[PDB]
Amino acid sequence: SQTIIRDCQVDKQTRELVYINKIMNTMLTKPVLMMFNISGPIRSVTRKNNNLRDRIKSKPDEQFDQLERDYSDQMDSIKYFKDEHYSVSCQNGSVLKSKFAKILKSHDYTDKKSIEAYEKYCLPKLVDERNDYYVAVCVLKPGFENGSNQVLSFEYNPIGNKVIVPFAHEINDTGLYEYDVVAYVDSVQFDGEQFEEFVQSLILPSSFKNSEKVLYYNEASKNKSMIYKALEFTTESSWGKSEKYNWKIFCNGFIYDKKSKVLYVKLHNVTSALNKNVILNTI
């Protein structure tokens, strides 16, 4: 149910975004819509083996585990790409905005109410005036969950040396969005400012201990730079000989390897009033 993203430069002009969504692995009863921004037009769409999900996920998870001290368990122009079960179209947001229902019908996404809903709560997040960023429309069809290929791979060419990390949620009534996504983005440049804005708006899960505090970290290390929040608290034995434990869990934010220009993102069960993408520069 978590969303896994891997975006890598595969050569001078091309990048590949691998997107694994929660939906993608459900018994789809009818066509499902997924839309997100991408920094350039797509030229190929493929499905990949499910083993890729854990391979990709382990990377950001591993990086963030290194920050924790979890004493648990202790003993003490529109382009189309189709398949028997999915249908995708790439186009500038303005275009999608200008022909939404037809394009969607094009992918066999009929339900009028649903179309209106997306046009009202989704599209606004995917259409920017300043830059007419591209949008990827994927309609998943029943049967997509049959087999071991519920992983979409988008081959594309970045416009203007930019890379969009698709975090934009659907606009909702409460103004609060719960995130659960991990990401791996290589060949990108650090952006402290927007990383901080994001980290500082996050609300961590609770350990239910009256003594817990949420600390904000923004530290640069030898090779890597980290911006994250963590839940910290102490636990001590009552029997005497107070062997104190300083727990440091629920670390979420951005970790950036300055040497290899790799970005690790983890926003696991955190809430925020921010509903936006992270747009970075390529290297």
Main sheet summary = 9 strands, mixed
Largest sheet: spatial strand order? 4-8-2-1-10-14-13-12-11
Number of domains: 1
- Helix/strand class: alpha+beta
PDB class: apoptosis
Keywords: helix-turn-helix, reactive site loop
Assembly: monomeric
Entry title: the 2.7 angstrom resolution crystal structure of a mutated baculovirus P35 after caspase cleavage
Question: Topology of this protein?
Answer:
Elements: E1 3-11, E2 14-20, E3 32-38, E4 42-47, H1 51-65, E5 79-82, E6 86-92, H2 93-98, H3 100-106, H4 112-121, H5 123-126, E7 134-140, E8 152-156, E9 162-165, E10 177-186, H6 192-201, E11 213-220, E12 224-235, E13 245-257, E14 262-272, E15 278-281
Parallel strand pairs: 1-10
Antiparallel strand pairs: 1-2, 2-8, 3-7, 4-8, 5-6, 6-7, 9-15, 10-14, 11-12, 12-13, 13-14
Give an overview in words.
This protein is α+β, with helices and mostly antiparallel strands. It has one domain (1-283): Baculovirus p35. The protein has helices spanning 51-65, 93-98, 100-106, 112-121, 123-126, 192-201, and strands at 3-11, 14-20, 32-38, 42-47, 79-82, 86-92, 134-140, 152-156, 162-165, 177-186, 213-220, 224-235, 245-257, 262-272, 278-281. A 9-stranded mixed sheet has the order 4-8-2-1-10-14-13-12-11. Pfam families: P35. Belongs to the protease inhibitor I50 (p35) family. GO terms for molecular function: cysteine-type endopeptidase inhibitor activity; cysteine-type endopeptidase inhibitor activity involved in apoptotic process.
